[PDB]
Each structure stands twice: as C-alpha cells, then as structure tokens.
C-alpha cells in the first residue's frame, strides 16, 4: 500500500515513505555488523568503510548490510510488503543496475522495484521533465541535462570533487592558518565548520580583497576568515585542489552546448540545483551570474534551488512513486521471474 524510497549516497543514506515531505531516515552510509549511527558510535571496535564511492556501489556485502539495516532497523518495515524505489548515479555501470535489481528481488523479496537516476528525480521534484541539473553530494558532482525525463548521456559532465573534497581542502587551508586538522575525527569537526560557516562569494576577487569564531570540543576558540569562501570556491575553480577540470559553471555551459540546439533555451531556463554541496549561501546567485556571463544575452537563465534541495532527489522519488502514470513502470516480481536482472534496462529509463 505504501512505497519505500531510498536514495543511497556516498556519504548519507536517505530513506523513507512516498508521500512524506522528507526522508524520515537519514544516516551515515558506513558499515563497521554495525551500520550508520550505531556503527560510528562504536568506532573503537570495528573498522568503518563507505560502501559507495563517488556515487557508485563498490562493496556489495556492506551495501546489503546498508539495505537490510534500512528496511529492518531504520524504517522498521518488511521489505516484502512495499514497492521500493532506489536511486543511482548518472553513468552507473549496467552490471551495477542489474546487481541492485537482483539483490532487491532475490535477497529482500520485494514485490516491486524501480531504479531512477538521482538528478532526474531532483528535476522531477521541481515539477519539470526538462532542464539541467547540477547535483552535488559528498562524493561526486554532475551536470545532467534532461529532456522529457531522459538524461542525455552524451552531454552529462562529471566533476570528480564534492563535499568530502571540500572538507579536506578546508582542513588544509585552516591548517595553513596555524591550526591542525588531520585525523578522521578532526575531519568531522571541519565538516561541521564547513556546513555552518562557509559560503560562496558573488565576486571572489572582491571578497578576497575584503570573520567568525568557532569553538572546538577541547574548548579552544578558533577564527575563520577567507577560508569561509575559499573552500567552496573550489567548485568554481578546481585548480585550488590541483584539478585540471573546469568549474561547475563552465561545465554547465559545456553540457548545454553538447545538447541539441533547439533544447538549449529550455536548459538555460530550467537549471536545478540539488544535493548537500549545493547548500552554500550565495551559490545560486553566483551560478546565475556565471552562467549569465557565459551565455548569450538572448537567454533567460533561471536557477531553481529550493530550501529543501539537500533532499530533492529523495523528494523527487517520493513524488514519482505516488503518481498514477508511474504504477505501470514498477518492475514486479513476476516480470523479474520472467526476465531476470536485465529487465532493469527495459523498465527503468
């Protein structure tokens, strides 16, 4: 009667029931026999690993632990009683999709199942089927242009840096300021600093040419200045961490330019942002500015970045799973019994 929606990120699992306004379960995507919060709080006994890297599932045994924990411990549901919508990264290898499907049907015995591209779900959450999504999380960043619900694979851009790299970079530059953040626990402290105090400058040079206190657990009060905006500037200038890639604005432009001439206008007018790393204050206005500088003046640029965007992917899934037009799209246990794992490529597009 009620669909489950799970968005498995590199850093956080977002899970819940279709219809809700937010994933009721949000917890670290880590396994230690111990998953999530339970796993972290017992850091001292187990070895903690992330089973998803850069948005791709790489440790299947631990991923199975994640899903099991999600159904039984977090949501407290029996998997068998709910259609389950899962998410995947842009350009996820086919074999991974099939393995996800196989696990869902054979290990968890779901009555029905679907897998959707994350960025497509955030676009959907905004009530659109055409537009270009900047989706940035803990592990990977993508520009994903979409026309009528189909991501355009030839025009997808991946930027191999996201929230975790930003946190590492703030550790670096704060250390240069005289402090020292090096270990994993210190990395968590710095992540908190990033989420509370960083922002994106409208004009980076002007900002530089022009500060907050943060109290550490040990009681020391440190001061953060230009680091606040230098950390997320890396998104616009990846050479800050030695990356040769163009910034998110430039890759948005390049992605659009790889698309059919007559859809470009529609991509420029429907630029959606989603994911934890798009939460910086000033990022929407900065992208507006940069895209405007890159685009022809004959173009209306609009950036859709709602307050709940950290969770837009999950929210998209939740909306989609409840639509009448979607119900014929579920992979049923019957269809999987008749076609095996490869049914995923036929049904989920």
């Amino acid at each position: 009667t009620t669909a489950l929606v799970c968005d498995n990120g590199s850093g956080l699992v977002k899970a819940g029931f279709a219809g809700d306004d937010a994933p009721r379960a949000v917890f670290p995507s880590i396994v230690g026999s111990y998953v999530g919060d339970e796993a972290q709080s017992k850091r001292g006994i187990l070895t903690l690993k992330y089973p998803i890297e850069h948005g791709i599932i790489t440790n299947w045994d631990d991923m199975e632990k994640i899903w099991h924990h999600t159904f039984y411990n977090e949501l407290r549901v029996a998997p068998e009683e709910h259609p389950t919508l899962l998410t995947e990264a842009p350009l996820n290898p086919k074999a991974n999709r099939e393995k996800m499907t196989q696990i869902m049907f054979e290990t968890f015995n779901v009555p029905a199942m679907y897998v959707a591209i994350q960025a497509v779900l955030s676009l959907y959450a905004s009530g659109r089927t055409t537009g270009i999504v900047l989706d940035s999380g803990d592990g990977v960043t993508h520009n994903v242009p979409i026309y009528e619900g189909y991501a355009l694979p030839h025009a997808i851009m991946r930027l191999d840096l996201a929230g975790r790299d930003l946190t590492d970079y703030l550790m670096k530059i704060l250390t240069e300021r005289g402090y020292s953040f090096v270990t994993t626990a210190e990395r968590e402290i710095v992540r908190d600093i990033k989420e509370k105090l960083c922002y994106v400058a409208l004009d980076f040079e002007n900002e530089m040419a022009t500060e907050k206190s943060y109290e550490l657990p040990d009681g020391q009060v440190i001061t953060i200045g230009n680091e606040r905006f230098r950390c997320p500037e890396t998104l616009f200038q990846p050479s800050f961490i030695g990356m040769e890639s163009a910034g998110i604005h430039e890759t948005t432009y390049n992605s659009i330019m790889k698309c059919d001439i007559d859809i470009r206008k529609d991509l420029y007018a429907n630029n959606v942002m989603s994911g934890g790393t798009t939460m910086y204050p000033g990022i929407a206005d900065r992208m507006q500015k940069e895209i405007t500088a890159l685009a022809p003046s004959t173009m209306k640029i609009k950036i859709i970045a709602p307050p709940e965007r950290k969770y837009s992917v999950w929210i998209g899934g939740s909306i989609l799973a409840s639509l009448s037009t979607f119900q014929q799209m579920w992979i049923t246990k019957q269809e999987y019994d008749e076609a095996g794992p490869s049914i995923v490529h036929r049904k989920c597009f």
Partner: peptide, 30 residues
Amino acid sequence: FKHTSAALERKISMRQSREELIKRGVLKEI
C-alpha cells in the same frame, strides 16, 4: 513534496518514446 505532483503527472503523461527522441537527434549514447 506534493505541490508539484499534479504538474509532473501531466508532463510524464505525454512523455515521448526513447526511440522517438533518438530519431529526432536529441537522445544519444555516450
């Protein structure tokens, strides 16, 4: 979370075939 579901439902209703989009040059594999 539901304030866009009507619009979306309408848009998905008249969603074009992958094949049609490949025919008209919009859809291409990497």
